């Protein structure tokens with residue numbers, strides 16, 4: 001019941017906040033160390049928010065061979081206790 | 085059920101569950117049967133993020149338990165260093181007293197929490213506040229045998245608050261959340277440090293636009309002059325903070341305010357070569373001919389710093405090219421004294437007089453020859469500076485150069501046709517000066533010439 | 536480290552009150 | 568987590584009272600009662616009791632702010648351990664007939680735990696010590712019963728291995744605990760405890776000897792070996808110290824060196840010169856352990872373990888004089904050490920449980936965790 005319909009990266013707003021609006025309004029360009037906002041859309045209404053939050057993690061990878069030791073891959077949960 | 089679950093989440097550090105409960109409508113100021121709210125429980129268990137979030141959601145910071153304990157009391161007794169730092173950063177009263185008279189410093193001292201004791205002492209905790217039994221933090225530390233706490237308490241004594249006020253700290257980090265909480269608690273945005281500076285001064289120093297806007301919107305004085313006379317506009321102009329200068333000018337900062345030494349913001353901008361700031365100040369009516377206590381105009385400051393483009397901009401804005409200080413120093417005199425031949429070129433090309441006299445009759449050529457500034461020398465002699473000008477004492481440039489022993493200056497002066505047989509007020513030739521100062525090479529070149 | 540700027544002495548040194556004063560107009564008289 | 572201790576107002580009283588009620592019920596259901604040398608036989612057990620309470624409780628009181636806990640917790644552990652040891656030696660060596668000899672043997676079982684607790688005192692609360700007492704007494708009884716079943720020795724006579732069992736059990740439990748000092752007056756009190764232990768250790772070296780001549784010879788050997796070990800320990804302390812001074816902490820334990828060295832063989836040493844040689848060698852080994860073991864938590868417990876091993880080795884060397892017996896005795900020692908280490912692992916993992924409300928590692932060796940003091944802020 002946690003299917004994903006779409007994810008909006010909000011390229012215009014984030015690029016405005018991250019001083020990359022001159023680059024594009026469609027591609028997400030962000031600068032490290034500063035938060036950016038995305039919107040996750042679900043196919044069905046989410047009944048219980050906390051178990052669903054416990055059920056989801058995010059992974060960011062860069063390069064052809066991403067790994068933790070190279071710091072080219074990070075897996076982090078979606079929670080208010082995350083290291084900002 | 086909802087409030088009890090919120091308190092359980094606050095105890096366990098389940099920030100997601102507590103935030104969900106707060107979103108549902110749970111009163112954030114709810115407490116258990118012991119009078120411990122969510123902030124108290126989070127401070128007990130050391131949940132820093134939960135403490136910060138609850139402070140951001142407007143929890144009453146000085147709420148006491150049934151024992152009179154604030155959150156800072158509980159964090160100090162529990163020895164939660166990060167929680168103590170965060171609570172103090174958000175404006176916790178370090179000298180709060182429970183019903184039995186205990187202070188946070190007493191609780192940290194009795195529990196042998198050295199780091200908490202030191203942090204509270206640096207934040208102005210009074211170690212002389214006694215309990216209802218008459219015991220001090222030192223007394224309980226002595227009774228419990230906490231030797232390190234006893235030693236630190238004795239060594240600190242009554243030095244007092246050596247940390248900045250919390251609003252100054254927030255302004256330094258451009259932290260709008262902590263500043264908002266602090267100003268919600270204490271409505272005075274002009275809190276003074278021991279040096280006399282407001283948080284607006286710090287925000288202007290670091291160009292922290294967001295916290296500066298917040299402070300100005302909460303009633304901070306844009307024109308707060310301390311005893312030294314350094315307004316936030318002075319600081320922003322000195323630091324080259326263009327956007328801060330524009331913001332402060334828009335909020336009513338005065339353009340003509342003087343420091344203790346009568347420095348205007350234009351003086352600070354020109355001293356550090358901030359061309360855009362100088363143009364902004366001039367367009368707002370800053371007096372280009374304002375003088376300091378020593379009679380220095382901003383063109384003097386720009387020439388002193390080798391700030392070529394600032395000199396150019398000031399000259400374009402009708403600055404007086406031959407303005408004199410109290411020592412009758414022109415900007416050309418300053419450029420010769422500091423060896424800035426580019427500034428001298430700009431000044432001479434714009435019509436500065438090459439033979440201006442200082443108080444002791446020194447020309448820019450005399451000063452350039454004194455300081456071995458050969459490029460300024462060639463530039464002055466190229467633009468009609470007298471090679472035989474004398475001071476009040478009758479010193480020629482060759483006299484000065486021979487006394488200082490600057491061989492290239494002497495060589496160039498004699499090659500351009502300076503007589504080595506000129507005399508001072510006392511009959512003293514350049515060879516006399518070279519002999520007196522023991523410059524064998526200068527004297528040898530003089531004697532090889534017609535001296 | 537990373538917290539020295541929270542103290543009054545370090546903030547005083549950072550703000551550089553001496554940079555807002557007219558230091559001197561040196562002459563360095565040639566005679567003595 | 569909070570460095571302020573959690574309230575034990577519900578855990579400790581319930582635990583202690585339930586233990587005492589269970590002990591009383593077991594004594595009612597399983598224990599039963601029953602001359603010229605009544606006082607003489609009572610004195611040996613009394614001497615063991617004096618050592619267990621006074622010497623062991625005060626020997627560990629040397630800590631700056633942990634003397635109360637050392638003394639009182641040792642008393643509590645002795646009181647629990649003797650009762651539980653009476654029941655356990657009753658269960659594994661047959662109803663339980665209670666005699667002065669059984670009380671003496673139960674006291675020895677309790678002193679094994681009391682020795683082991685020195686490696687963990689200052690890092691645990693009372694409930695953890697209760698768990699340690701119960702599990703260690705049970706493990707020592709199990710080891711003795713296993714040795715009786717395999718090597719056909721008496722269950723009560725197998726209590727000779729209690730030095731080495733206690734040393735390795737304590738070291739293991741201490742190794743399992745989370746990772747983290749002296750004062751003059753607690754040092755003098757610890758010297759009082761060490762002096763009583765040193766003075767009455769010949770009563771440790773012959774409770775289990777039925778014959779009078781064996782008791783006589785063992786007592787003589789222990790006395791002379793202890794004298795030699797005291798002299799060697801005090802003299803050689805300056806060598807094994809960075810500042811070339813005598814360490815009171817080192818002396819407090821190194822005085823017992825010769826007694827431990829001859830503990831399992833004092834009845835077989837035929838002349839006092841051999842016991843004196845063993846005491847001298849024990850003192851020299853104590854010097855070397857003080858100087859070398861810290862390079863490679865409690866150093867005094869480490870040299871105690873080394874000395875117990877050395878006592879077992881000299882028992883092996885002497886038992887041949889008075890090679891299959893060598894193999895049997897080596898297997899006995901290896902089984903004893905293996906069971907000690909395994910039960911120590913189990914005890915340490917049990918002690919690490921959250922429910923015991925153990926002191927924070929920043930609050931180790933501090934009486935304020937467990938004891939009431941005036942002019943303190945209490946609670947939240």
Ligand SMILES: CC(C)CCC[C@@H](C)[C@H]1CC[C@H]2[C@@H]3CC=C4C[C@@H](O)CC[C@]4(C)[C@H]3CC[C@]12C
Nearest residue numbers: 001002003004042044045046047048051052055
């Ligand atoms: C025992 C074997 C033979 C068959 C058992 C399969 C049944 C019990 C399992 C297998 C897959 C499971 C489903 C997997 C995913 C979801 C989505 C979740 O949001 C609601 C429950 C639901 C719909 C599960 C219901 C139970 C389920 C149908």
